[PDB]
Amino acid sequence: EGLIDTAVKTAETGYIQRRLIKSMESVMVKYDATVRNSINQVVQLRYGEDGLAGESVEFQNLATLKPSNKAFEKKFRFDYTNERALRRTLQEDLVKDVLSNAHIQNELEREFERMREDREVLRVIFPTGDSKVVLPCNLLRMIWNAQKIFHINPRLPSDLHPIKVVEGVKELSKKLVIVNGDDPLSRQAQENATLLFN
Amino acid sequence: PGHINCIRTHSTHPDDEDSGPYKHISPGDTKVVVENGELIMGILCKKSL
Amino acid sequence: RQKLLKEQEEKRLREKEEQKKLLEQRAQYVEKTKNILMFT
Amino acid sequence: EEMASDELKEMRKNLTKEAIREHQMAKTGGTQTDLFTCGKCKKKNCTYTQVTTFVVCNECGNRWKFC
Amino acid sequence: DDEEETYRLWKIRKTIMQLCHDRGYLVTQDELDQTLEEFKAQFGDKPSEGRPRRTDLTVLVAHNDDPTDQMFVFFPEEPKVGIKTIKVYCQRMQEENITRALIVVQQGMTPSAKQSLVDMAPKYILEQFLQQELLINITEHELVPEHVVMTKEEVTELLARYKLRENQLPRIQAGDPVARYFGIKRGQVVKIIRPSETAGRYITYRLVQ
Amino acid sequence: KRITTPYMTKYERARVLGTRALQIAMCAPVMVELEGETDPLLIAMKELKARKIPIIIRRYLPDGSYEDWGVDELIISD
Amino acid sequence: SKTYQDIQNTIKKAKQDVIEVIEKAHNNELEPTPGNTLRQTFENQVNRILNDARDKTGSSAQKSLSEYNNFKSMVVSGAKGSKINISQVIAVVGQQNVE
Amino acid sequence: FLLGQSARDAERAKDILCRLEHTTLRKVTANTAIYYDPNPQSTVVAEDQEWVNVSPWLLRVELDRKHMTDRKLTMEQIAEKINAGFGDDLNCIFNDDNAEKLVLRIRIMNDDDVFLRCIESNMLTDMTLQGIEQISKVYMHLPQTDNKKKIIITEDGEFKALQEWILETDGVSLMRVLSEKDVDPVRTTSNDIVEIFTVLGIEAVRKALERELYHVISFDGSYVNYRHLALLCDTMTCRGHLMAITRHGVNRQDTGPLMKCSFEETVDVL
């Protein structure tokens, strides 16, 4: 029985593959960053709806997906009231700044609000709470490499003002572009395409 | 080569080990941990190579 | 706190806009029911 | 059915219950255990099947395999 | 049946109201999601040779921005609608400046009727829907993504942005249930928004042809 | 007003290296000091690294337009 | 030489259980499982019993091996083989299904 | 997927399954005997049901009780249907639901011998007492994996998958199924491609095709990047209609004769 099954599979799979290859032999990604066929008919405005090669993509997990409202609040809010916690994590020359300054507090509140909005989007986009998702850059591995290179020693108070993180994240979100162009439609498409990774 | 960093689990890794104590020191020498491209723990198998 | 209050009153304005849309829809339904009646 | 006698009503109820039970589908077999944590629901209840050990979530229903 | 017929009529009406609201015609938030109790209490709940009889529950709704544009929703009683019924409907419509309409036929209209329907097309747009096709609102289905009928200006803007000829965009035949639901016609682009698992959101376009 | 990506695709890099190697093998002047090697492909690779290949790629768009990039203009992937 | 005793005991138990199932089916006690006819449910029960027996035998054989064993080393390294292979080689082959 | 309270308790789901399953006279009938009983009150057979109620021949179509109970039917509706389907040309004298035997009596009032044979044959073969066509039988299986369990975000935040009754059919109607009450009109897919193209729309067909392909490619535990599946789906759903990958679907596209002849129908396309 096993041998017969093997023989028939060897006879059928070849034909299946031939038809598949002959039905999409001309589709390609033109320099306009779009997928078209020999008749120049657009099949996808971006390859794979994202415009990224399948080689440099890794499995990862979405930390802000499927948490519990309370845990999400106490894991991404950066409470700026517990000065003891701030002294433990940040340095003295930063605790006073993050306390006295109100602009920093407003900025952090806005960050948390955007985080909640992204959480809502993720919940309405990935039903069934599937944290496992595929993305280009493995941020956890990058962070680990940074730690091991610069010898972070995660026990001492670090010198990294939260505003630096916020501004850097915004600048990087600006740098990573897929749909070039300042047109309103262009920007809408850029945001949509590079939504999940953001 | 280089300074790689990665974590993997060996084939014969008892599931009820991370939860209990000895998480970071495994009697069965599992939980492959590589830092700065230097093997530290675990036994390499297909899951890691 | 004042910003919260002005947000609340803006929501009140939106509620009043809902009220006006409802009243306009009723004021056109009063005329439209006549056409519905004469149709049969 | 309302006007049917007591014995007839009892027989009809038994027949309906038997038919309802028979219409169902047999549940998938497996060794239920709480040693595996499902990543799709966070629950511990689940069932395993060895043949590669496939894991099926008990409440959440997460499906995975371990080699 | 009586109760089942009343339920079917109510579901049909709810679907029609949802459809008009989707298209853009202004409708009550009340009638948009009215339950069945008020429907019974309104008409009489005796469709079997009683008050809630077809052709009496028709509704006329005007467009949101264009109050001069309306569209009827008829309910002919003939299971096999002929040509005379549609003829009289069109004749009575001609009194008003209305142009669009919607026919709800019990069973499939005779082929001879479709010819007349298309014949009067440029002067009076009217389409047909089987009650079996109206008992459910597809646009809510999980598979069906969110459609958005685009305006000519933005269609031209899109074509000029991508330097792409509209003939090169994807196609979607008018017979598509979604197409007939939105009332789109030939030479008109529909935006599609799908949840992308690898990009969060992905927006595409389809030209009707 | 060029909208093509500012990186050199692997296809373009491969073709440029090959064509420059053929030109060198046909006794064409080099654009970099030779350290004592003879393989035309190696010389082409060195020139690519030094950004001195006298070639400009013409990327055609689906519409019909095109853009002329200079090898010494866009960033080299490898 | 003890794993053999375990395997023989398990196989005898499985044989006895299938014989009892056959007796019940013959005397009309095995009620039809939902969604299946009497023959279908009988076959399903027999197959489940046999598969359970095979799995138990294989688990015993695996737990009876020694670290120096070579089958186990190759299987755990995953180079070539699997646990079912060792189970078939030592404990018992199993059911020979067709179609 | 059941929508109403039936999603929880099987009792109120069995009726839904019965009404979605096609049931016929052959399924509920046990014996069918024709008799040439001259006088209706004569009643060659011993049955005290005709005298109370009051052509020289009749059909005594006795029905089974176990099947009739399982599908939960009544002789009132059966008689109404049998009379209406063949018009006001017969007179079905049903029996009360108290007697042990579920006898009936079909008589014709206004070749005639074979007329009864023909009518009984054509009704027994197909009558549609309760249900729709196509759907032969319906299963009722609880979900064991997340792929079919209901998911609802709890006020606390966790997903907390719920276990609800779900039906598994063996035919394809979809259109008539979604219209039935207590049937979630939002998650009841069809597992068929061409049917969805006539019910939901081209985009829905694309999505369903993607899901089916992913299911059949990941069943064996293998993994295929989603980009390729998406590209294949788009290529199959670019021209609006479902272009088959066969020679009958790719050669119809206006690609080019030199490209069609390579795949197939070399001399024909040229």
From Swiss-Prot, chain C:
It is found in: Nucleus speckle. Component of the PAF1 complex, which consists of CDC73, PAF1, LEO1, CTR9, RTF1 and SKIC8. The PAF1 complex interacts with PHF5A. Interacts with KMT2A/MLL1. Interacts with STAT3. Interacts with SETD5. Interacts with ERCC6. (Microbial infection) The PAF1 complex interacts with Zika virus French Polynesia 10087PF/2013 non-structural protein 5/NS5. The interaction with viral NS5 proteins may reduce the antiviral immune response by inhibiting the recruitment of the PAF1 complex to interferon-stimulated genes, thus preventing their transcription. It comes from Homo sapiens. This is RNA polymerase-associated protein CTR9 homolog. Widely expressed. Component of the PAF1 complex (PAF1C) which has multiple functions during transcription by RNA polymerase II and is implicated in regulation of development and maintenance of embryonic stem cell pluripotency. PAF1C associates with RNA polymerase II through interaction with POLR2A CTD non-phosphorylated and 'Ser-2'- and 'Ser-5'-phosphorylated forms and is involved in transcriptional elongation, acting both independently and synergistically with TCEA1 and in cooperation with the DSIF complex and HTATSF1. PAF1C is required for transcription of Hox and Wnt target genes.
UniProtKB/Swiss-Prot annotation, chain D:
It is found in: Nucleus. A zinc finger (TFIIS-type) spans 34-65. Zn(2+) binds at residues 38, 41, 57, 60. It comes from the Eukaryota. Necessary for efficient RNA polymerase II transcription elongation past template-encoded arresting sites. The arresting sites in DNA have the property of trapping a certain fraction of elongating RNA polymerases that pass through, resulting in locked ternary complexes. Cleavage of the nascent transcript by S-II allows the resumption of elongation from the new 3'-terminus. It is linked to A chromosomal aberration involving TCEA1 may be a cause of salivary gland pleiomorphic adenomas (PA) [181030]. Pleiomorphic adenomas are the most common benign epithelial tumors of the salivary gland. Translocation t(3;8)(p21;q12) with PLAG1. S-II binds to RNA-polymerase II in the absence of transcription. Belongs to the TFS-II family. Interacts with EAF2. Associates with UBR5 and forms a transcription regulatory complex made of CDK9, Pol II, UBR5 and TCEA1/TFIIS. Part of TBP-based Pol II pre-initiation complex (PIC), in which Pol II core assembles with general transcription factors and other specific initiation factors including GTF2E1, GTF2E2, GTF2F1, GTF2F2, TCEA1, ERCC2, ERCC3, GTF2H2, GTF2H3, GTF2H4, GTF2H5, GTF2A1, GTF2A2, GTF2B and TBP; this large multi-subunit PIC complex mediates DNA unwinding and targets Pol II core to the transcription start site where the first phosphodiester bond forms. This is Transcription elongation factor A protein 1. The lineage of its organism: Eukaryota, Metazoa, Chordata, Craniata, Vertebrata.
